Structure 1
Amino acid sequence: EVQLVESGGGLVQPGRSLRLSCAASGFTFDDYAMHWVRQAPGKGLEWVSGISWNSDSIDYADSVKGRFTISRDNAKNSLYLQMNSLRAEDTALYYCAKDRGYEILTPASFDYWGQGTLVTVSS
């Protein structure tokens, strides 16, 4: 019943930067871990990044290391993702899934998911 609203999607040229916002209101956000994952238009799901309940332990996907950064605002119960140095392969769908646990690297997986937002990287 929890709500996960995502925005920031659109069409941008390769090499530009943008922001994605994911806001949650149906649960307590101060003690849950959150993750960004990627579903390709013609392939399966892939994990991208995630943050814990507090901004101490942080992880990124190997294919996106050094390019993407995440931020978390517990005051307004939301998180942001900065899209930098975009290339032709980043035109997929992105979800904002909620981890069952509190840390970043735990055997507990994502509990509740949100509707994906479509981004396009082309001229």
Structure 2
Amino acid sequence: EVQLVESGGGLVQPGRSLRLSCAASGFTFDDYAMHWVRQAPGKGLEWVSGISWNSDSIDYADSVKGRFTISRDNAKNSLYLQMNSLRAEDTALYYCAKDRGYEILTPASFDYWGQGTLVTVSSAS
């Protein structure tokens, strides 16, 4: 019954920054951990980043260390993510998942997901 919708999908050039956000409405956003999952066009799922219920612990995937910056806004009940120094391998599909617990690295998995928004990293029209 919860809704996980995001925005910001589009076409950007390599080396250009793009910011994604995600709106959650169907649950209590103040005390759940949240994560980002990437769906490659010709591969399987992959975890990107995750933040705690409040911003003490932030973790990043190895392939995106020092390139992405995930934020959080509990007042507006929405989270953000910054994509910087993009290369050609970041043309995948991104989901906005929700963790069952309140920490980043726990045996609790992602219970609710949302529809993805496709992004492209190329120089075209």
Q: What band does the TM-score fall into relative to the shorter chain?
A: over 0.9
Residue 5 of structure 1 deviates from its aligned partner by 1.1
1:33-81 CA-partner distances (Å, limit 9, x unpaired): 0000101001000000010100001100000000000000000111000
1:68-123 CA-partner distances (Å, limit 9, x unpaired): 00000000111000010000000000000000010000000001000011000001
Bigger proportion of residues as helix: 2
- May I ask how many residue pairs the two structures share in their alignment? 123
The whole-number CA distance in structure 1 between the counterparts of 2:47 and 2:87 is: 18
Gaps of 5+ in 2: none
- TM-score, normalised via structure 2 length: 0.97
The whole-number CA distance in structure 2 between the counterparts of 1:66 and 1:109 is: 25
The whole-number CA distance in structure 1 between the counterparts of 2:93 and 2:3 is: 19
Gaps of 5+ in 1: none
Query: Alignment identity in percent?
Result: 100
